[PDB]
Design a protein around this motif. Structure first.
Motif, PDB file in Angstrom:
ATOM      1  N   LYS A  76       2.705  -1.152  -4.902  1.00 44.11           N
ATOM      2  CA  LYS A  76       3.043  -0.812  -6.280  1.00 44.11           C
ATOM      3  C   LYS A  76       4.517  -0.449  -6.414  1.00 44.11           C
ATOM      4  O   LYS A  76       5.201  -0.942  -7.318  1.00 44.11           O
ATOM      5  CB  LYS A  76       2.156   0.332  -6.774  1.00 44.11           C
ATOM      6  N   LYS A  77       5.025   0.403  -5.517  1.00 44.74           N
ATOM      7  CA  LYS A  77       6.426   0.807  -5.586  1.00 44.74           C
ATOM      8  C   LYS A  77       7.364  -0.382  -5.446  1.00 44.74           C
ATOM      9  O   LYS A  77       8.446  -0.393  -6.044  1.00 44.74           O
ATOM     10  CB  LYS A  77       6.732   1.843  -4.502  1.00 44.74           C
ATOM     11  N   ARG A  78       6.968  -1.385  -4.667  1.00 43.44           N
ATOM     12  CA  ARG A  78       7.774  -2.572  -4.432  1.00 43.44           C
ATOM     13  C   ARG A  78       7.510  -3.679  -5.443  1.00 43.44           C
ATOM     14  O   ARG A  78       8.120  -4.748  -5.343  1.00 43.44           O
ATOM     15  CB  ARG A  78       7.523  -3.098  -3.014  1.00 43.44           C
TER      16      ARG A  78
ATOM     17  N   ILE B 294      -2.082   4.121   1.403  1.00 40.98           N
ATOM     18  CA  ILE B 294      -0.623   4.150   1.472  1.00 40.98           C
ATOM     19  C   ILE B 294      -0.056   2.743   1.325  1.00 40.98           C
ATOM     20  O   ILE B 294       0.977   2.538   0.675  1.00 40.98           O
ATOM     21  CB  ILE B 294      -0.163   4.808   2.785  1.00 40.98           C
ATOM     22  N   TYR B 295      -0.723   1.756   1.926  1.00 44.43           N
ATOM     23  CA  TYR B 295      -0.288   0.369   1.797  1.00 44.43           C
ATOM     24  C   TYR B 295      -0.278  -0.074   0.336  1.00 44.43           C
ATOM     25  O   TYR B 295       0.708  -0.646  -0.145  1.00 44.43           O
ATOM     26  CB  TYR B 295      -1.194  -0.531   2.638  1.00 44.43           C
ATOM     27  N   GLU B 296      -1.373   0.186  -0.390  1.00 48.23           N
ATOM     28  CA  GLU B 296      -1.427  -0.179  -1.804  1.00 48.23           C
ATOM     29  C   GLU B 296      -0.330   0.520  -2.595  1.00 48.23           C
ATOM     30  O   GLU B 296       0.237  -0.057  -3.529  1.00 48.23           O
ATOM     31  CB  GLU B 296      -2.797   0.157  -2.396  1.00 48.23           C
TER      32      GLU B 296
ATOM     33  N   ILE C 242       6.867  -3.644   5.043  1.00 53.42           N
ATOM     34  CA  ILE C 242       5.945  -2.738   4.363  1.00 53.42           C
ATOM     35  C   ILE C 242       5.191  -1.887   5.376  1.00 53.42           C
ATOM     36  O   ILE C 242       5.096  -0.661   5.233  1.00 53.42           O
ATOM     37  CB  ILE C 242       4.975  -3.534   3.470  1.00 53.42           C
ATOM     38  N   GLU C 243       4.636  -2.525   6.413  1.00 58.94           N
ATOM     39  CA  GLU C 243       3.902  -1.778   7.432  1.00 58.94           C
ATOM     40  C   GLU C 243       4.787  -0.750   8.121  1.00 58.94           C
ATOM     41  O   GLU C 243       4.307   0.326   8.495  1.00 58.94           O
ATOM     42  CB  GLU C 243       3.301  -2.734   8.467  1.00 58.94           C
ATOM     43  N   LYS C 244       6.076  -1.053   8.290  1.00 61.84           N
ATOM     44  CA  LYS C 244       6.984  -0.083   8.894  1.00 61.84           C
ATOM     45  C   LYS C 244       7.089   1.173   8.041  1.00 61.84           C
ATOM     46  O   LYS C 244       7.160   2.287   8.572  1.00 61.84           O
ATOM     47  CB  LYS C 244       8.365  -0.703   9.103  1.00 61.84           C
ATOM     48  N   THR C 245       7.101   1.015   6.716  1.00 56.74           N
ATOM     49  CA  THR C 245       7.139   2.183   5.842  1.00 56.74           C
ATOM     50  C   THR C 245       5.801   2.909   5.838  1.00 56.74           C
ATOM     51  O   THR C 245       5.759   4.143   5.793  1.00 56.74           O
ATOM     52  CB  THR C 245       7.534   1.769   4.424  1.00 56.74           C
TER      53      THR C 245
ATOM     54  N   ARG D 145       3.732   3.193   8.314  1.00 57.93           N
ATOM     55  CA  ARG D 145       3.675   3.999   9.532  1.00 57.93           C
ATOM     56  C   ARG D 145       4.539   5.246   9.412  1.00 57.93           C
ATOM     57  O   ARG D 145       4.179   6.309   9.931  1.00 57.93           O
ATOM     58  CB  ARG D 145       4.106   3.173  10.746  1.00 57.93           C
ATOM     59  N   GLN D 146       5.690   5.136   8.744  1.00 59.19           N
ATOM     60  CA  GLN D 146       6.522   6.313   8.516  1.00 59.19           C
ATOM     61  C   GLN D 146       5.823   7.310   7.601  1.00 59.19           C
ATOM     62  O   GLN D 146       5.927   8.525   7.802  1.00 59.19           O
ATOM     63  CB  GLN D 146       7.874   5.894   7.935  1.00 59.19           C
TER      64      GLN D 146
END
Length: 183
Positions: free
Chosen positions: A178-180, A172-174, A143-146, A148-149
């Motif tokens: 949600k998307k996942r 962005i993390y939240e 998740i953190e990798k996305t 950062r992107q």
């Protein structure tokens, strides 16, 4: 080394579900309170890491003129000072080694909690908690990798690490959660 609220809750719930409900190597007379106690452990560990940062920034704030005279960049001195203070405060800087400390604190909680019984050798319980934590960290890391992107396109408009940047990172993390489907 971030430990967001959702990751902490996933770890606490997984400990209760897998070791308490499924395997039964833990007997929890009050699972809801036990979960709150685990969450409080992570909150305290996070507060310690924040205290480590403020003490490190305090050293460098007090040595502004020295850093200039030494020609040592603030970022170089910050990592070095943080390494020293982390040892003095017994705080592991590596997130995995820091999680091992937190895992041991979870074991300390389990062992001292009069509302908890164990049926297996404590080091084996710790190994199983480690496996649960590591599995959740694998999810946190992807998740953190996305994040950062996605936050790269805003990197120059906000000071990296600033409060405004932390808010956007969390936003962005939240959104990734949600998307996942991870709430």
């Amino acid at each position: 080394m971030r430990l967001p609220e959702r990751l902490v809750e996933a770890i606490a719930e997984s400990i209760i579900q897998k070791l308490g409900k499924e395997e039964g190597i833990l007997e929890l007379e009050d699972p809801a309170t036990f979960k709150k106690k685990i969450i409080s452990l992570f909150k305290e560990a996070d507060r310690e890491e924040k205290e480590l940062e403020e003490k490190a920034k305090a050293v460098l704030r007090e040595n502004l003129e020295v850093l200039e005279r030494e020609n040592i960049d603030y970022r170089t001195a910050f990592l070095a000072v943080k390494r020293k203070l982390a040892e003095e405060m017994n705080i592991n800087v590596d997130r995995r080694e820091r999680l091992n400390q937190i895992i041991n604190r979870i074991m300390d909680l389990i062992m001292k909690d009069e509302s908890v019984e164990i049926y297996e050798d404590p080091p084996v319980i710790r190994k199983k908690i480690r496996e649960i934590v590591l599995g959740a960290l694998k999810i946190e890391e992807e998740i953190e990798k996305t994040v950062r992107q996605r936050i790269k396109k805003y990197s120059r408009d906000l000071l990296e690490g600033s409060p405004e940047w932390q808010i956007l990172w969390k936003r962005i993390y939240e959104d990734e959660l949600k998307k996942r489907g991870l709430a």
